[PDB]
Scaffold this active site. Sequence first.
Site, PDB file in Angstrom:
ATOM      1  N   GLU A   1       9.275  20.971  -1.669  1.00 33.90           N
ATOM      2  CA  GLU A   1       9.638  19.978  -1.072  1.00 33.90           C
ATOM      3  C   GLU A   1       8.647  20.069   0.282  1.00 33.90           C
ATOM      4  OE1 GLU A   1      13.814  21.756  -1.157  1.00 33.90           O
ATOM      5  OE2 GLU A   1      14.048  19.808   0.163  1.00 33.90           O
TER       6      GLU A   1
ATOM      7  N   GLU B   1      11.976  11.210   6.330  1.00 32.40           N
ATOM      8  CA  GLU B   1      12.480  12.253   7.144  1.00 32.40           C
ATOM      9  C   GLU B   1      13.069  12.327   8.515  1.00 32.40           C
ATOM     10  OE1 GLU B   1      13.713  15.320   6.977  1.00 32.40           O
ATOM     11  OE2 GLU B   1      13.846  15.891   4.905  1.00 32.40           O
TER      12      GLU B   1
ATOM     13  N   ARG C   1      21.955  24.374   5.889  1.00 28.55           N
ATOM     14  CA  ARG C   1      20.665  24.037   6.279  1.00 28.55           C
ATOM     15  C   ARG C   1      20.010  24.668   7.429  1.00 28.55           C
ATOM     16  NH1 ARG C   1      21.500  19.790   2.564  1.00 28.55           N
ATOM     17  NH2 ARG C   1      19.773  18.625   1.817  1.00 28.55           N
TER      18      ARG C   1
ATOM     19  N   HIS D   1      10.232  23.964   1.630  1.00 26.79           N
ATOM     20  CA  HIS D   1      11.473  24.505   0.884  1.00 26.79           C
ATOM     21  C   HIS D   1      10.941  24.781  -0.668  1.00 26.79           C
ATOM     22  CE1 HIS D   1      13.766  22.091   3.984  1.00 26.79           C
ATOM     23  NE2 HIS D   1      13.388  23.083   4.459  1.00 26.79           N
TER      24      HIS D   1
ATOM     25  N   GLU E   1      17.371  27.974  -2.752  1.00 28.66           N
ATOM     26  CA  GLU E   1      16.328  27.361  -1.891  1.00 28.66           C
ATOM     27  C   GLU E   1      15.682  28.320  -0.629  1.00 28.66           C
ATOM     28  OE1 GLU E   1      17.619  24.553   0.984  1.00 28.66           O
ATOM     29  OE2 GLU E   1      16.085  23.137   0.783  1.00 28.66           O
TER      30      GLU E   1
ATOM     31  N   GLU F   1       7.158  18.468   2.948  1.00 25.58           N
ATOM     32  CA  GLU F   1       7.157  17.385   4.165  1.00 25.58           C
ATOM     33  C   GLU F   1       6.162  17.312   5.050  1.00 25.58           C
ATOM     34  OE1 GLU F   1      10.770  19.438   5.894  1.00 25.58           O
ATOM     35  OE2 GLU F   1      11.874  18.038   5.103  1.00 25.58           O
TER      36      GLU F   1
ATOM     37  N   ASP G   1     -22.120  28.036  -4.069  1.00 25.89           N
ATOM     38  CA  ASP G   1     -22.493  29.032  -3.103  1.00 25.89           C
ATOM     39  C   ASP G   1     -21.132  29.667  -2.556  1.00 25.89           C
ATOM     40  OD1 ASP G   1     -23.480  30.553  -0.750  1.00 25.89           O
ATOM     41  OD2 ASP G   1     -23.839  28.663   0.141  1.00 25.89           O
TER      42      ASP G   1
ATOM     43  N   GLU H   1       9.080  12.725   2.792  1.00 21.23           N
ATOM     44  CA  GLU H   1       9.438  13.484   1.819  1.00 21.23           C
ATOM     45  C   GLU H   1       9.379  12.646   0.287  1.00 21.23           C
ATOM     46  OE1 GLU H   1      12.583  16.595   0.108  1.00 21.23           O
ATOM     47  OE2 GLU H   1      12.332  16.473   2.475  1.00 21.23           O
TER      48      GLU H   1
ATOM     49  N   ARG I   1      13.989  28.419   2.308  1.00 24.02           N
ATOM     50  CA  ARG I   1      13.746  27.224   3.308  1.00 24.02           C
ATOM     51  C   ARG I   1      12.798  27.646   4.374  1.00 24.02           C
ATOM     52  NH1 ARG I   1      17.232  23.099   3.490  1.00 24.02           N
ATOM     53  NH2 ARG I   1      16.698  22.735   5.685  1.00 24.02           N
TER      54      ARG I   1
HETATM   55  N1  LIG Z   1      16.805  25.249 -11.768  1.00 20.54           N
HETATM   56  C1  LIG Z   1      15.938  24.841 -10.774  1.00 20.54           C
HETATM   57  N2  LIG Z   1      14.916  25.725 -10.555  1.00 20.54           N
HETATM   58  C2  LIG Z   1      13.941  25.541  -9.839  1.00 20.54           C
HETATM   59  N3  LIG Z   1      13.771  24.137  -9.318  1.00 20.54           N
HETATM   60  C3  LIG Z   1      14.599  23.047  -9.472  1.00 20.54           C
HETATM   61  C4  LIG Z   1      15.756  23.397 -10.011  1.00 20.54           C
HETATM   62  N4  LIG Z   1      16.248  22.317 -10.438  1.00 20.54           N
HETATM   63  C5  LIG Z   1      15.743  21.277  -9.414  1.00 20.54           C
HETATM   64  N5  LIG Z   1      14.947  21.840  -8.934  1.00 20.54           N
HETATM   65  C6  LIG Z   1      13.907  21.547  -8.064  1.00 20.54           C
HETATM   66  O1  LIG Z   1      14.427  21.459  -6.575  1.00 20.54           O
HETATM   67  C7  LIG Z   1      13.704  20.884  -5.691  1.00 20.54           C
HETATM   68  C8  LIG Z   1      14.941  19.699  -4.849  1.00 20.54           C
HETATM   69  O2  LIG Z   1      14.390  19.029  -4.007  1.00 20.54           O
HETATM   70  P1  LIG Z   1      15.175  18.125  -3.009  1.00 20.54           P
HETATM   71  O3  LIG Z   1      16.122  17.071  -3.886  1.00 20.54           O
HETATM   72  O4  LIG Z   1      14.469  17.621  -1.836  1.00 20.54           O
HETATM   73  O5  LIG Z   1      16.396  19.388  -2.605  1.00 20.54           O
HETATM   74  P2  LIG Z   1      17.108  19.135  -1.168  1.00 20.54           P
HETATM   75  O6  LIG Z   1      18.397  19.279  -1.419  1.00 20.54           O
HETATM   76  O7  LIG Z   1      16.790  20.685  -0.701  1.00 20.54           O
HETATM   77  O8  LIG Z   1      16.642  18.182  -0.204  1.00 20.54           O
HETATM   78  C9  LIG Z   1      13.085  19.502  -6.833  1.00 20.54           C
HETATM   79  O9  LIG Z   1      11.745  19.501  -6.636  1.00 20.54           O
HETATM   80  C10 LIG Z   1      13.839  19.632  -8.003  1.00 20.54           C
HETATM   81  O10 LIG Z   1      12.964  19.391  -9.283  1.00 20.54           O
HETATM   82  C1  LIG Z   2      16.762  17.234   6.091  1.00 25.46           C
HETATM   83  S1  LIG Z   2      16.000  18.856   5.830  1.00 25.46           S
HETATM   84  O1  LIG Z   2      16.959  19.828   5.978  1.00 25.46           O
HETATM   85  C2  LIG Z   2      14.759  19.032   7.111  1.00 25.46           C
HETATM   86  C3  LIG Z   2      14.048  20.407   7.062  1.00 25.46           C
HETATM   87  C4  LIG Z   2      13.107  20.584   8.251  1.00 25.46           C
HETATM   88  N1  LIG Z   2      12.116  19.596   8.112  1.00 25.46           N
HETATM   89  C5  LIG Z   2      12.308  22.002   8.024  1.00 25.46           C
HETATM   90  O2  LIG Z   2      12.568  22.772   7.186  1.00 25.46           O
HETATM   91  O3  LIG Z   2      11.623  22.019   8.878  1.00 25.46           O
HETATM   92  N2  LIG Z   2      15.355  18.571   4.226  1.00 25.46           N
HETATM   93  P1  LIG Z   2      15.825  18.618   2.846  1.00 25.46           P
HETATM   94  O4  LIG Z   2      17.299  17.868   2.910  1.00 25.46           O
HETATM   95  O5  LIG Z   2      14.995  17.981   2.071  1.00 25.46           O
HETATM   96  O6  LIG Z   2      16.331  20.214   2.527  1.00 25.46           O
HETATM   97  C1  LIG Z   3     -25.666  25.917   0.737  1.00 27.23           C
HETATM   98  S1  LIG Z   3     -27.345  26.166   0.800  1.00 27.23           S
HETATM   99  O1  LIG Z   3     -27.561  27.669   0.863  1.00 27.23           O
HETATM  100  C2  LIG Z   3     -27.947  25.698   2.317  1.00 27.23           C
HETATM  101  C3  LIG Z   3     -29.376  25.539   2.584  1.00 27.23           C
HETATM  102  C4  LIG Z   3     -29.762  25.318   3.960  1.00 27.23           C
HETATM  103  N1  LIG Z   3     -29.261  24.041   4.387  1.00 27.23           N
HETATM  104  C5  LIG Z   3     -31.177  25.392   4.433  1.00 27.23           C
HETATM  105  O2  LIG Z   3     -31.678  24.855   5.488  1.00 27.23           O
HETATM  106  O3  LIG Z   3     -31.861  25.794   3.480  1.00 27.23           O
HETATM  107  N2  LIG Z   3     -28.003  25.326  -0.388  1.00 27.23           N
HETATM  108  P1  LIG Z   3     -27.825  25.707  -1.821  1.00 27.23           P
HETATM  109  O4  LIG Z   3     -26.695  26.451  -2.154  1.00 27.23           O
HETATM  110  O5  LIG Z   3     -27.887  24.205  -2.390  1.00 27.23           O
HETATM  111  O6  LIG Z   3     -29.247  26.293  -2.166  1.00 27.23           O
HETATM  112 MG   LIG Z   4      15.644  21.251   0.900  1.00 27.46          MG
HETATM  113 MG   LIG Z   5      14.610  17.625   0.173  1.00 31.82          MG
HETATM  114 MG   LIG Z   6      13.179  17.534   3.820  1.00 35.10          MG
END
Ligand SMILES: Nc1ncnc2c1ncn2[C@@H]1O[C@H](COP(=O)(O)OP(=O)(O)O)[C@@H](O)[C@H]1O
Ligand SMILES: C[S@](=O)(CC[C@H](N)C(=O)O)=NP(=O)(O)O
Ligand SMILES: C[S@](=O)(CC[C@H](N)C(=O)O)=NP(=O)(O)O
Ligand SMILES: [Mg+2]
Ligand SMILES: [Mg+2]
Ligand SMILES: [Mg+2]
Lengths: 475, 475, 243, 475
Positions: free
Chosen positions: B130, B216, B344, B273, B363, B132, B51, B224, B365
Amino acid sequence: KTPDDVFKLAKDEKVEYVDVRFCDLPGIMQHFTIPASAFDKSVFDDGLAFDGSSIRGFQSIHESDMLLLPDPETARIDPFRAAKTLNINFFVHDPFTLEPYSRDPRNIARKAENYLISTGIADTAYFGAEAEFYIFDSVSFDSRANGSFYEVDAISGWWNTGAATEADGSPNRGYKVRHKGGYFPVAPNDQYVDLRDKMLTNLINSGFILEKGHHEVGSGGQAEINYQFNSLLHAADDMQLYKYIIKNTAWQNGKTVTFMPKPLFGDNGSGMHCHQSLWKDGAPLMYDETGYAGLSDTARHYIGGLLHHAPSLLAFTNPTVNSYKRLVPGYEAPINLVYSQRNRSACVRIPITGSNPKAKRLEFRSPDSSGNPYLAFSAMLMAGLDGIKNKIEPQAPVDKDLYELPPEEAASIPQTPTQLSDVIDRLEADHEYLTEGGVFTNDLIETWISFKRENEIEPVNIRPHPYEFALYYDV
Amino acid sequence: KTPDDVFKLAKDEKVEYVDVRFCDLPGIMQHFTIPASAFDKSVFDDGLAFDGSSIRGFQSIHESDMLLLPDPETARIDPFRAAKTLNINFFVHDPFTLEPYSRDPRNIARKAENYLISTGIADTAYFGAEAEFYIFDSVSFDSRANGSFYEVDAISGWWNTGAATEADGSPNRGYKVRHKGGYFPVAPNDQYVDLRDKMLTNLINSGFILEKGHHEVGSGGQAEINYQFNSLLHAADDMQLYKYIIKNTAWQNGKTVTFMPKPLFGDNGSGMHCHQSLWKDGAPLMYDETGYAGLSDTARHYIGGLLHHAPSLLAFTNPTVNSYKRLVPGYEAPINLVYSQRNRSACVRIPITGSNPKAKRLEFRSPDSSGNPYLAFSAMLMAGLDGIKNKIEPQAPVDKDLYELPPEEAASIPQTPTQLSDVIDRLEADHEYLTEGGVFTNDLIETWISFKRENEIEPVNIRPHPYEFALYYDV
Amino acid sequence: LHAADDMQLYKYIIKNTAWQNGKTVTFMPKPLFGDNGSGMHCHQSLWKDGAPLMYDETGYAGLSDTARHYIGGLLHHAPSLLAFTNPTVNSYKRLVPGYEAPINLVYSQRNRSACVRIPITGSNPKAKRLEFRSPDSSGNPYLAFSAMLMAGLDGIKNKIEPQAPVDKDLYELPPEEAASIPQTPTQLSDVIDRLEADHEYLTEGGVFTNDLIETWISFKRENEIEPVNIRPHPYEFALYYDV
Amino acid sequence: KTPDDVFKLAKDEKVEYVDVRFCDLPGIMQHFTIPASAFDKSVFDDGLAFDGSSIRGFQSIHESDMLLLPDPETARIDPFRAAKTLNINFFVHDPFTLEPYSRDPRNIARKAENYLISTGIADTAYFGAEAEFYIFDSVSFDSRANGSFYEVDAISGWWNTGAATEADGSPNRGYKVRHKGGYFPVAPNDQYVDLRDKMLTNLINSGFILEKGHHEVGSGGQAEINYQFNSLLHAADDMQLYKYIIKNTAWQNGKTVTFMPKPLFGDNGSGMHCHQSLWKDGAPLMYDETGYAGLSDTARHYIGGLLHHAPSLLAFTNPTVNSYKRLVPGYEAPINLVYSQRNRSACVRIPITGSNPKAKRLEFRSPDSSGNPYLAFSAMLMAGLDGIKNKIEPQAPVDKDLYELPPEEAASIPQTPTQLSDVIDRLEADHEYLTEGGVFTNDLIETWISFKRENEIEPVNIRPHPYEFALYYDV
Ligand SMILES: Nc1ncnc2c1ncn2[C@@H]1O[C@H](COP(=O)(O)OP(=O)(O)O)[C@@H](O)[C@H]1O
Ligand SMILES: C[S@](=O)(CC[C@H](N)C(=O)O)=NP(=O)(O)O
Ligand SMILES: C[S@](=O)(CC[C@H](N)C(=O)O)=NP(=O)(O)O
Ligand SMILES: [Mg+2]
Ligand SMILES: [Mg+2]
Ligand SMILES: [Mg+2]
Ligand SMILES: Nc1ncnc2c1ncn2[C@@H]1O[C@H](COP(=O)(O)OP(=O)(O)O)[C@@H](O)[C@H]1O
Ligand SMILES: Nc1ncnc2c1ncn2[C@@H]1O[C@H](COP(=O)(O)OP(=O)(O)O)[C@@H](O)[C@H]1O
Ligand SMILES: C[S@](=O)(CC[C@H](N)C(=O)O)=NP(=O)(O)O
Ligand SMILES: C[S@](=O)(CC[C@H](N)C(=O)O)=NP(=O)(O)O
Ligand SMILES: [Cl-]
Ligand SMILES: [Cl-]
Ligand SMILES: [Cl-]
Ligand SMILES: [Cl-]
Ligand SMILES: [Mg+2]
Ligand SMILES: [Mg+2]
Ligand SMILES: [Mg+2]
Ligand SMILES: [Mg+2]
Ligand SMILES: [Mg+2]
Ligand SMILES: [Mg+2]
Ligand SMILES: [Mg+2]
C-alpha cells in the site's frame, strides 16, 4: 546517388527551394537558397558563385570569388522550413582552374579517404561519433570595459531547486536534476523525453540509422543521441546534419542547444568520443583474440599513433579555448594519455564487445564538438596511420581510476595539454604526419594556427576573468 | 510472456520506440530509448551496454561497462509519451562472463524467490503493498553557507485557510482539508477525485488489477491506490511501475507527487504497508482456526522473524533519514516491535478477514516507499524464513492503543530504531540471515552501508537544522 | 566562580554593544555551514599557596604529573563530560573535521586539531597550562567549569594516564591510525545517555547532586533532543522528494 | 627608535589601543588589537602569540603556535580609528628557538639588506615605488555552476556618459573621463581633487615625505601619490602603510579602492614602478657622465641582472594571474625586455635627470602591487646584485616606441612572459640567484610556487571565461 536521382527526388517531394550548403574552416555550415526553377544541370556543370572574403579561413577581399559544386549523396529534405526545401552539401573549387580548394574541409575528408587506399593498409575508415549536448532554456553574456558576464539557464538545473516560481511565473514542481545525476532517471526527473523523441524522429526521417537516445550526466538537460557509424567523409557529413537537426528541433520547441565542451562549472562537459575501426575488402582488421583487450597489432599501432601525436593532434580534435576547461579530472573526460579497456577515465577506452571481430574498435575520448568534424576525423586518421606505418607501440595500459592517482604517481604518465596555445605551438613545430600524401597542406595549417591565435587565444587572454576579481580585488 | 510475444505486441501496437529500463541500488528506475527498428533478436541474445559508473551502487569508472538483458514479462505500453513507446525492464549482467550482477536489485528478487523453493517451506511468497503519496502543487528548497529552507504547498492544505487568494490569484473557496482529517470526506472537500480517477484508469490500462482508490488521512492531498497482490518479483516490478504512473499522471495534470515518508510535520506520514502470505502447491499456509488472530505456527514464526530481525531489517525497509521522522507516535505508524490484530498502532497488524484461509495474512506496517522494493521485499522474506527455520516466537500480542500505555509498560516493549545510522550500524554487525543461500552478498551489503553513510547520514549530520536557530540563536 | 561570572558579564556586554550599534550577536556553536564554528576553549591551571602546580621541565610539553593526570581525567570522562561542556544539538555540528575544533580524544602541544592543546609558553611556570578545546558557549559556564574541574580532579586522584600525545594533523591521519583513537561523541543524545549511566565523579563531595543531573537530562531530552528529532530537515527534501 | 621611544609616544599621545601588525606570505597585512595597559616590556621581552595555521603560507595546524616581536621603527598613530590607536609592525619568530621565521616577508627584506653589506658592493639600496590605484564607487562579482560575472563602477567612468541619472538618482552632469584621458585635466573633469587632498594629508601626518599627487591615465578614477624613496625594508613598510591609508581614506569617504593590475579592459592598468639606486658611505654609485644615459658600470650591470633574470623574477614582482592582463601593448606597461632613457614603453626607463649624481637611477616598470613588497624589492635586489657580481651586460638600449616595432625587429627582442604559470615554472627551474646568502630559502620558494599553483593558477584555469560564451555557444 547521381544528378538524376537528385532531380527526381526534388520533383517527387514538390520542392519549392534548394538550400546550397558548405563548410567554413572553423566548422560552421554556410548556406544560400535557390528557387527550384533555378536547380538544373547547369548547377552540376558550371556550379554556383559566392564571396570567399566573408567566409572564415577562406579568401582575401581582392581574391574573393569562389565556386561551389554539388555532392549528390548529401541531398536531404529539410524538416523545419514551411516552404518545402531540399538541402545539398557542396565542395569548394577555384573559379579559374575548377580545382578543389585547399582550405575546403570537405576536400580534406575526400583526400584523407583516398590517401588511406593508397597506403594498402586498409580501404575504409569507420567513425562512430557521440556528440553530447545541453538543452538549455536561455543564455546571455557580454564583455565591456568595466564588466563582463555569462549565464545559462534550464528548468531542470539544480541551481533552481530554491526558485519560488518558474520563469513563466508557474510553480516550482521540483524533480530537478542533481549535478552529475542526469544519467539517467525516468520521468518526471527526466524532463526532456518528448523533445528527444522529436529529435529522434527528425533524424530517422532524414536517413539516420538510430541506435539510442538518453539524458546525459549533466544537470540542466544534457543529452546524447547515437547513430550508426559510417566511412570518414559520410560520418563528418552526418555530424554536421545531426547538429543542425538537434539545434533546430530544440529551437522550434522553445529551447536552445549548445555543443560547447564546458558550459557548466562543476558538472560534466560535452565530448565527441570517436569510435574508430579500419577495414579491408569488407573485413575488419582491429581484432586479435590473443591481444590485450582483443586488439590486433594494427589496432595497437593505431592507438600508438593517436597517443603519440596527441600534443599536436588536439589542435584539430580539441580546437577551442573552452575545450581545455573540459580536460579536468572527475567528469569522464581524459586528463592523461592512457589507453585502457572498460575505462571511462582514460584517453582511449576499449569498450567490452566479446569475440565478434566486427564489433572490435577503439574509442578516442579526447575530442569534443567545438570545431570541424572533417578536419578532426581526418587528423585522427593521419595520426593512426603514422602509428601503423612506423609501428608506434603505445605505453602499457593503465587499468585504474585515473583521477584518484596520488600526485607522485599521476606525474609519471604523460598528461593532456593544459591550454589551446600549447597545442597550436606544438602543431606549428611538428605537423609532418598531417601533410603526408598532401591530405593537409601547409597553407591550411598556417591559416588554422593564425586564425586560432588572432581570433580566439589573444581575445580571451587580454580580458580579465571574473574570478580574478574574487582573488585580487583587495590585494 | 516470451520474446516472440513481445515482438508481436510491438508490431500490433505499431510502436515507434522501446524504453530500456533497470533499477539502481537506492531504488530509482533508470532508462534509455531505442527505435523499434533496433529492437530485435540481438537485444535478447547479446544485450545492450551502458555506463555502470554513472549508476549509484554499481561500478567504478575503470570498470564502467555493464550489460543489460530483457525481461519479456514486464513489457507494457507507455501511457504518457506522444510517440508510441513500449517499456521493458532489464536484468543487469557482467559484460565478460554474462552472469547476473551481484548488485542488480531485480537479481536479488530472483534469488529470493529461488531460495524460498529450495527451503521446502513454500513455493510462493505473495506481497500486497500500500504505497501512500501526497499530491502537492509545488515544492522548493536549498542549502547554503548562511541559510537553508524547504516548502511544500497544496491548495487543499489547512495552512492555507487564511489565504486571500489562490496561487493563480483566483478566490479562496474554502473546503480545505483539516490536519489528520483527509480520510475521507466526499467532494468538494476531496479536491482530487478526477485526478485519482485518471490514475486508476492509467493503472487499469497498464494491466493492474485494481481494488480501490482514496484520499488518505493527511491534509494537502494525501492518497492511496490499492492493486492485487502478486509474487515477490512481479510485486516489486508492479511497485516501480505504479510509482511511475502515479508521478507522471500527476505531472501531466499540473501537479507534483512525493513518496517521501514524512513531508509534513504534525500530520500523517506516507507508509508502504506490506501484506504477506506464504503458499505451497496452490494452497495458503498462514491459517489456523485455533491460533491467535487465526494464525498458523508458520505465520507466527514469520512474524517472529520480522520482529526479531527488525533492528537490522529496517535498513532496507526504512532506508532513509526522513524515514525516522515517520516513526513517531500519533500517526498510525509503528513506534515499537509488537504484533496485534485489528491494531493500526502496531508494527504488525493482522486484518480482520474471517474464516477464509485464502484471505489470511500479516500486515508489516513499518516499511515506507523511500527505497528499493526489490531489496525491501527480499529482506522481509529472508527475515521471515529465519523466523520459521529457527521457530522464533514473537513476544505476546498487545491489543491496546500503543501510543497511550503507561511509561512503565512501554518500557518492557522494544522500541523501533530512533535513526538511520543505528540500523546501518546494526546491519553491519549482524546480517547473516540475509546472506543465507547467497540471496544477499557481502559486496551488496557493504556497498549499501557505505552509500548510506557517505551520501545520506553524514550530509544531513553536518548541516544545521532550522529549529537549532529557534532553540539556540540567543544562547 | 569569578571566571564564570566574568563569562556571563562578557556575553551581556558583547550582545548589547552590538545591539546598541545596529547589529545582532550569536554565541551558538555552528551558525554557518562550511566555515568555522564558535568555541569556548578553557585554559586551565591549578595553584597552591600562590604557586603553580602545572610545570615540570622534564615532562612532555613541560607538564607535571598533576597536569598530565588532569588531562587524563578530561579525556577519560569526555563521553559524559560533554553533556555540560557541549550541551546543545548545535554543539555537534561544530565537532566535525577541518575547522580547528576537536574530532578525537588526544592531547598535543602546539596542536589546534587536538582536544587538548598545550600552548608554547617557555620556562615560566606561571604560564604553563592546558587548553581544553572541546567546550562551546551554548550552555552554562558555572556548570561547564565545575564539571571540567571534577573530571580533572578524578584524574589526579586516580592517577589517570592519558594516551600518548599525537603530534600530527588529526584530520589527515590514515584510516588504520585514525580508527585506533577514541572519537568525540556524534550527537547530544549520546552524551546525555552516558551522563545518565556514569556521573559518580561529578557527585563527589556533593558538588553536583542527583536532582540537578536528573533535571539536566530530563530538560535536554524533552526540550531540545526530541523537538529537533521529530522535525524534517530541509536537506531531507534535497535528498528524498523524488524517491 | 628604541622601545622607550615608543612607550613615550604611546603615553604622550594618550593612546587607548595598540594594533599589532605583520605580513602574510602573499602580501596582506594582518592585525590584532591590545589595550594600552597590555603594551608593556613583556611584549618586547616575551613577544605575543598567534595562530600560524590561519595565516597563508605559514604553518600547518599541528605546528600552529607562532611568535611576534615588535619593530619600534614602524610605530605610527592611526588616522582612522575613533579610539586613539598606535600601529606597530612585528617580526615573526619561532616560539621555541626565538629565531626569525624563514617565511616572514619582513625577515626576507632584513636578510637582503644584510647580504648587500656583506658583498662590499654597497651598503644601501634605495627604492622609490609608484603604486597606482583606482578610486571606484562599487564592485560586485560571483562564480556559480551556470554563470559568473564581475562589475566595477565609478561616476567618472566613460561607460556612464549615457546614464539618465547617477547611482543615487541625481542628474548626470557630464565631465566624465575619456578612456586613456585621465592624465590630467583640471576639475571638474578631475572629480577626485578633494579626496586625493585628504589622502595626501593623512600620509603627511603619518610621517611620509610627499612629492606629488595626481589623476592617472585611466577613466573611472585612476590615481597616483608619490613619496620620498627609502632603504629597502623601510620602503616596503612604507608601501604597506601607504596601501592601508589610501584604502581607508577612500572607505571613510564613501568610496572603494583597488590596487589590482588590470581592473579595466581597454584602459591603463595599475603598475608599481620601482626607481632603484645603490649607495655606499653616503655617496651614489649609479652615475658616470661617459655612459649611455649617464649610467655607471654598476648601474648597467644591475639592469643586466634585472633583464636576464626577469623570466623568473616576475614570479615575485608580477605575482598574479591578473598581472599578465596588464602586460599587453598600448598602455605604458612593458611587453619586452629592454632598457631605454625617456622611454615609457620600455621594461627599464632611465628618467631624464641631468648632471646630479644623487638623482641618477633606473626605473623598473614591470612590477605591479598585486603581491608582497618585501619579497618583490628583495627579489629585485638579488637579481641586480647577481648582475653586478657577474658583470651581465644588458642588450643595447632601443630608443623607440616598442609597441610599434617592425615584425623582424620585434621578434629579435625577448618578450615578457605571457602568464603566471610560465614564471612560476621558470622560478622552480632556476632560482639560485635568490638563495645566495640564504636571503630566500628553498622552503620559502617551494611554498610560494605551491600556493600560486593550488590557489590561483588552477582555480582560474578550471572556470569558463564569459568571452568563451561569446566565441563558442553556437559551435
Ligand atoms: N492473502 C494475501 N496475501 C498477501 N496479500 C494480500 C492477501 N490478500 C489481500 N492482499 C493484499 O493486501 C493489500 C490490502 O490493502 P488495503 O486494502 O489498503 O489494506 P488495509 O486494510 O491495510 O488498508 C492489497 O494489496 C491486497 O491485494
Ligand atoms: C489509514 S492508515 O492506517 C494510515 C497509515 C499511515 N499513513 C502510515 O503508515 O504512516 N492506512 P491503511 O488503512 O491503508 O492501512
Ligand atoms: C557517460 S559518458 O562516459 C560521459 C562523457 C563526458 N560527457 C565527456 O565529457 O566525455 N559518455 P558515454 O558513456 O556515452 O561514452
Ligand atoms: Mg494498511
Ligand atoms: Mg490501505
Ligand atoms: Mg493507508
Ligand atoms: N566496429 C566499429 N567501428 C567504428 N564504430 C563503431 C563500430 N561498432 C560500433 N560503432 C559505433 O560506435 C558508437 C558507440 O556509441 P555509444 O553506444 O554511445 O558508445 P559508448 O559505450 O561509448 O557510450 C556508435 O556510433 C556505433 O555506431
Ligand atoms: N636616487 C634615487 N633612487 C631611488 N629612487 C629615487 C631616487 N630619486 C628619486 N627617487 C624616487 O623615485 C620616485 C619617482 O616617482 P615619479 O615622480 O612618479 O616618477 P615617474 O612618474 O617619472 O616615473 C619617487 O618616489 C622618488 O622619491
Ligand atoms: C583560530 S582558533 O584556533 C579557531 C577555533 C575555532 N573557532 C573553534 O571552533 O574552536 N582559535 P584560538 O587561536 O583563539 O585558540
Ligand atoms: C603615466 S605612467 O607612464 C602610466 C603607467 C601605467 N599605468 C602602467 O601600467 O605602468 N606612469 P608614470 O608617468 O607615473 O611613470
Ligand atoms: Cl590558450
Ligand atoms: Cl542518522
Ligand atoms: Cl541528538
Ligand atoms: Cl596562468
Ligand atoms: Mg555513449
Ligand atoms: Mg556519453
Ligand atoms: Mg562514449
Ligand atoms: Mg584557544
Ligand atoms: Mg609617477
Ligand atoms: Mg604613473
Ligand atoms: Mg613611473
